[PDB]
Design a protein around this nucleic acid. Structure first.
Lengths: 223, 180, 86, 155, 186, 66, 125
RNA sequence: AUUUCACUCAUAUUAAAUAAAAUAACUCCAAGUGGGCCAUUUUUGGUAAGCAGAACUGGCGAUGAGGGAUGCUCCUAACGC
RNA sequence: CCUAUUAGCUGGUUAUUUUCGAAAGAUCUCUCAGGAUCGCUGGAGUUGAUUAAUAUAAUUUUACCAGGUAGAGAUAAUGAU
RNA sequence: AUUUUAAAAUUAUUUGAAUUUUUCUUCUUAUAAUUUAAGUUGUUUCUAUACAGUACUUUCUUAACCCACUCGUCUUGAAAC
């Protein structure tokens, strides 16, 4: 009867080991990605040619306005991408459907491309997870890989580093990881906004719209 | 480095192309350098101009390059002539203005400030055409011509701008604006 | 289970290594790479920069050609305006 | 004060320019079966069996077929709920709906793909792709093809 | 401020606790929701839920329907949370093993003479805690008269709702709106 | 006095408060007034099918119960 | 403001008073929720007689205990003291107001030998 | 057309995406309400109106808080301690 | 005295906390200061879900439909000029 | 009173291996301890060597800074001249 704890311990050891190996391979993959991008851009410069990189496939979008005075279409889209509070943030996979959904809500959000370090620190610092049985979730901070394994293990994604990988690269298990992840509740920016009323792309100071790579500096002071 | 002194206008070189279709196989590639706070604003302006001059919009187009041009000699002073199109409260006008400073970005920031101060022309009403270095021989505006004398010197009649620490409220005796 | 304090998963080393089994190895490798002395880079900066002469040449030519194109466009629009003026 | 049957149908029930005249003879050969989707477009040249103003351009599945008429079940929004409405029209006012044709072609093509995939013991994605972000490309272009664009002056 | 339906609180519908202050029924409810919680049995969960229901949702079941439902499996036990009533239209019973909340005196006597036996829910918990070979049955819940007045109002087209009338002669609510000869019909 | 004759204001909000209900879409629809001489024939088809099926089942039951 | 002694934290003092009771004699200070239409207090205008809420509720671990960190129990004779023999350090005893000096001495001495503290020990003497 | 037998059409990510989607669906009984008004945009009559009459959405009503000195309707934002 | 006549009208309508929470549309009406009836709301109850699905959606994508408002036209028709 | 466990980390020994080649290199082999795990603990003073005061708790009365228009009611709208 005492053998059950022993086998549980050994399978936990095995899980820790292949999680370590998976994380190491993820790190190699990130480094190789950066190296190949740099070298390929260098080759494109050397030849008389152009190199356009792929779109990042993942957008971090944070709400900017409150819950009052919104058109019903805007409210429906906000419900669909789980942006319910004024400073909520979520990950969205980028395709034509989600891009069109984001277009109708653009003046009320700001979004961009999260990059690996900000994805990791978002998960580590503000990462909360829906634990309970379906429709009874009971948000809990991660603090452990046990619940990640319990709910998402069947996709071979037991581990916060696996979650980070699946989020940073729009991996085969992205919808599941995103849905498992509670919507991020962010604090106001450390140095404040420019003007929530105006677009980021307006020549005057403004905040809403697609920030592209500039979302990271904002997340860092909103975190 | 002094961030208070530093503006945040930068020059961006942007190259784009319509998505190839069945109708045309090799669309001509459009290239332009513009001035914006950041590369995102730069790309937005590039696509705005693509739509305005060509019949090409963001949806049917793709980026090919977006880099930042840095001044080769950020500490040499050079004269810039910038052509300009802006719309007023009652019409649209072209004007040519001259500046002189180290970087084209600084010249453009000067231009935006001057337009706002003189003609109340907001940045949304401004379209920069053809900013380029000009030699001292063909400088046209007198306020730039007078800055290219063989030996330039003048006094420093500006009032002192002391530190907040030494900007004390009660003074023991009346300070002198005469200075020197 | 009873709720305890949510330990900072980034600064609390024990909880960070518990969450990321590879983190302590990665951090140790980073520390080892940091612990390198200065004489090697002092005597290899010239070696690393002299091989970049061809890169500087290549990057000079693209910007040179871009400025040539800009100047050519300026000249052609000026010529068009001069032709139209009369 | 006026809510007749054909009120407000001045343009909706008018024939197109140079497209007047009775329905083509081939339309009477159209094959209709129970339960298939059908479009309700009113043909003004045929007065009997004309659908009501609202249902022009709507779609619904056939629930009844008679000698020269079709009863088609159409959803109508009434304040706080949709409700099913049985509209009875003649043949000229109904046409086979293409609202399903992409689904039918997808079914056939996907079946004949799944058969071969299972034959070769391969795993395939049968769902539609909702194509999004394009991959990185390494494109070449002659230097004589790049053209410099700058905003135009006013005139 | 946050945008949630029902301000974020899950809403359930229906009974939560038994309203009956019957000590024996309270003991039964305690035992059976203990069984439902501890065992995995949906059988036990359903019994615990049905013990909670109002009187109108545990209708009587006749011996005729009991026999008919238990026709195919003769060795199992019919568990019905309502009461069991005798059916005079039935000629003969056969060897019935039935657990029920209440038994009519006539139904009880008929079952004992037929050779089966009547079981209470505490005995059912004692002998079949999980519910092996126990068929869960219930009488007609929509058969009661009050339901004949529900649905579409009497007067709506094709409505079968029975109206509320003093009596049902020819001179009671049968003239205008119930025949074509007087204005419309239904 | 003069009365506000009409407005559709707030009606859409009222409609969406309990959602726009959809029809239940049952599997079988009553055939009360549809295609006679066809559904009568269908009744005959079904009657014959039950007759043959039930007589086969009765034959099996009799030969298995002796 | 909040008052905190030991583990007991009282989230609010100065019990709520009825609106306008200060300037009307017929209006007693005992709290009544104002229905009104334009009522100020009901609308929660700032700087006017805030209303009681459930948010002021003291925590249930230290709800009913007195400053001596134990619950009070009111007794009328020595017979009602028996249950205190088990929880003499969780309950203090208060003698009911209508108990005579006959019985008050008896209850005081019984509580003394029972080792349970008395709140109004020096009453009627 | 129905019925019965066969074979089998992705499901291991789910026949496109997203979804604190079952907080659903249905039934019963019943309250109050059935004078509205304002803002943006559109619009009819009118010279115009803080005028009369309509459309969409959001608000005020039913609602406080920070700001607009001041203000039922503006901006921010909706409220346990 | 019948008679505490009737009043679609005015005034009033008595403890606390907690939870849910409107309508000022619509149809008919000797109806326009009213009513009934839908709609909106509460309570009750069952069937379901509780299986990161399916039902479902003030959302999008894909496929396919219908339109004659903005614009445009007067040399395309009518009406002008 | 049968998960403040397990592990995770650290220290001290120990087994083999790897590798960026080692005074925080990593991975296990065992042992024993710690907490960085597994939501604040310790020391010293004072209260004070008192039985109710000038301290401490509390009520009340006064100030002071900021804020605060009569409630009930009909009403779209009441502090309403």
């Amino acid at each position: 009867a005492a053998k059950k704890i022993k086998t549980l311990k050994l399978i936990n050891k095995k899980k820790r080991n292949d999680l370590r190996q998976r994380t190491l391979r993820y790190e190699e993959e990130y480094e190789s990605e950066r190296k190949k991008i740099i070298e390929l851009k260098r080759e494109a410069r050397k030849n008389n040619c152009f190199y356009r990189e792929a779109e990042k496939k993942v957008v971090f979008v944070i709400r900017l306005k409150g819950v009052n005075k919104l058109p019903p279409k805007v409210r429906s889209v906000f419900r669909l991408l789980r942006l319910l509070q004024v400073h909520n943030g979520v990950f969205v996979k980028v395709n034509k459907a989600t891009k069109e959904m984001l277009k109708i809500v653009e003046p009320y959000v700001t979004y961009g491309y999260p990059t690996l370090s900000t994805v990791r620190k978002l998960l580590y610092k503000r990462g909360y997870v829906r634990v309970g049985k379906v429709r009874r979730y009971a948000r809990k901070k991660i603090q452990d890989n046990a619940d990640i394994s319990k709910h998402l293990g069947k996709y071979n994604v037991h581990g916060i580093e696996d979650m980070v990988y699946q989020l940073y690269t729009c991996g085969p298990v992205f919808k599941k990881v995103n849905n498992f992840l509670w919507a991020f509740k962010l604090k106001p920016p450390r140095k404040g906004f420019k003007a929530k009323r105006h677009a980021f792309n307006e020549p005057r100071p403004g905040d809403w719209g697609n920030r592209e790579a500039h979302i990271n500096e904002l997340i860092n002071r909103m975190i | 480095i002094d961030n208070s002194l530093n503006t945040n206008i930068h020059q961006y070189h942007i190259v784009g192309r319509a998505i190839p279709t069945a109708k045309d196989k090799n669309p001509n590639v459009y290239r332009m350098c513009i001035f914006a706070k950041n590369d995102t604003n730069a790309k937005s302006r590039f696509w705005y101009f693509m739509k305005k001059i060509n019949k090409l919009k963001k949806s049917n187009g793709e980026l090919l390059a977006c880099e930042q041009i840095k001044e080769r000699f950020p500490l040499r002073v050079k004269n810039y002539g910038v052509l300009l199109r802006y719309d007023s409260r009652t019409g649209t006008h072209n004007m040519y203005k001259e500046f002189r400073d180290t970087t084209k970005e600084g010249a453009i920031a000067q231009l935006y400030s001057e337009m706002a101060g003189r003609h109340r022309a907001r940045a949304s009403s401004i379209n920069i055409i053809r900013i380029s270095e000009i030699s001292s021989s063909l400088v046209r505006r007198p306020h730039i011509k007078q800055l290219l004398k063989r030996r330039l010197r003048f006094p420093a009649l500006h009032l002192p701008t002391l530190q907040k620490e030494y900007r004390k409220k009660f003074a023991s005796k009346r300070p002198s604006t005469y200075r020197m | 289970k009873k709720r305890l304090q949510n330990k900072n998963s980034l600064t609390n080393f024990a909880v960070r290594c518990r969450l990321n089994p590879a983190y302590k190895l990665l951090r140790s490798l980073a520390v080892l790479r940091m612990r390198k002395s200065i004489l090697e880079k002092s005597k290899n900066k010239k070696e690393k920069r002299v091989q970049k002469q061809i890169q500087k040449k290549e990057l000079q030519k693209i910007n040179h050609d871009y400025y040539k194109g800009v100047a050519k466009a300026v000249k052609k629009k000026k010529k068009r305006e001069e032709k139209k003026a009369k | 004060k006026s809510r007749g049957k054909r009120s407000g149908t001045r343009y909706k029930f008018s024939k197109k320019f140079r497209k007047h005249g009775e329905c083509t003879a081939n339309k009477y050969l159209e094959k209709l079966n129970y339960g298939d989707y059908v479009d309700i477009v009113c043909d003004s040249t045929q007065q009997k069996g004309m659908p009501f103003n609202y249902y022009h351009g709507k779609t619904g599945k056939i629930f009844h077929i008679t000698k020269r008429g079709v009863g088609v079940l159409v959803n109508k929004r009434v304040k706080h709920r949709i409700e099913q409405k049985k509209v009875c029209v003649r043949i000229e006012h109904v046409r086979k709906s293409r609202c399903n044709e992409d689904f039918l072609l997808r079914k056939i093509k996907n079946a004949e793909l799944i058969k071969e995939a299972k034959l070769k013991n391969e795993h395939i994605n049968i769902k539609r792709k909702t194509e999004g972000p394009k991959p990185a490309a390494m494109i070449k272009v002659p230097p004589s093809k790049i053209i410099t664009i700058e905003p135009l002056p006013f005139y | 401020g946050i945008a949630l339906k029902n301000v974020g609180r899950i809403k359930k519908h229906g009974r939560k606790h038994l309203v009956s202050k019957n000590p024996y029924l309270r003991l039964l409810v305690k035992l059976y929701n203990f069984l439902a919680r501890r065992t995995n049995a949906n059988f036990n969960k359903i019994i615990a839920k049905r013990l909670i229901m109002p009187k109108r949702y545990r209708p009587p079941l006749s011996l005729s329907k009991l026999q008919y439902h238990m026709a195919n499996h003769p060795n199992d036990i019919a568990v019905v949370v309502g009461s069991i009533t005798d059916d005079k239209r039935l000629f003969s019973l056969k060897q019935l093993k039935v657990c029920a909340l209440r038994f009519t005196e006539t139904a009880r006597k008929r079952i004992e003479d037929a050779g089966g036996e009547c079981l209470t829910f505490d005995q059912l918990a004692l002998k079949y805690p999980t519910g092996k070979k126990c068929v869960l049955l219930r009488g007609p819940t929509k058969a009661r008269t009050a339901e004949k007045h529900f649905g579409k109002a009497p007067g709506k087209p094709k409505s079968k709702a029975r109206p509320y009338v003093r009596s049902k002669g020819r001179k009671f609510e049968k003239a205008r709106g119930r025949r074509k000869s007087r204005a419309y019909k239904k | 006095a003069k009365s506000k004759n009409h407005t559709n204001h707030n009606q859409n909000r009222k409609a969406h408060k309990n959602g726009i209900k959809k029809p239940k879409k049952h599997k079988f629809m009553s055939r009360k007034g549809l295609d006679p001489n066809f559904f009568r024939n269908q009744k005959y088809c079904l009657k014959g099918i039950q007759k043959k099926k039930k007589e086969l089942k009765l034959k099996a039951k009799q030969e298995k119960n002796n | 403001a909040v008052k905190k002694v030991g583990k007991i934290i009282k989230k609010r003092t100065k019990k709520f008073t009825r609106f306008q009771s200060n300037r009307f004699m017929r209006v007693k200070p005992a709290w009544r929720k104002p229905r009104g239409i334009d009522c100020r207090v009901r609308r929660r205008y700032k700087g006017t007689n805030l209303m009681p809420s459930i948010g002021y509720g003291s925590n249930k671990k230290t709800k009913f205990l007195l400053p001596n960190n134990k619950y009070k129990y009111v007794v009328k004779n020595v017979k009602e003291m028996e249950p205190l023999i088990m929880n003499h350090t969780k309950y203090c005893v208060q003698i009911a107001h209508n108990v005579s000096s006959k019985k008050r001495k008896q209850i005081i001495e019984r509580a003394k030998q029972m080792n349970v503290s008395v709140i109004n020990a020096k009453a009627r003497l």
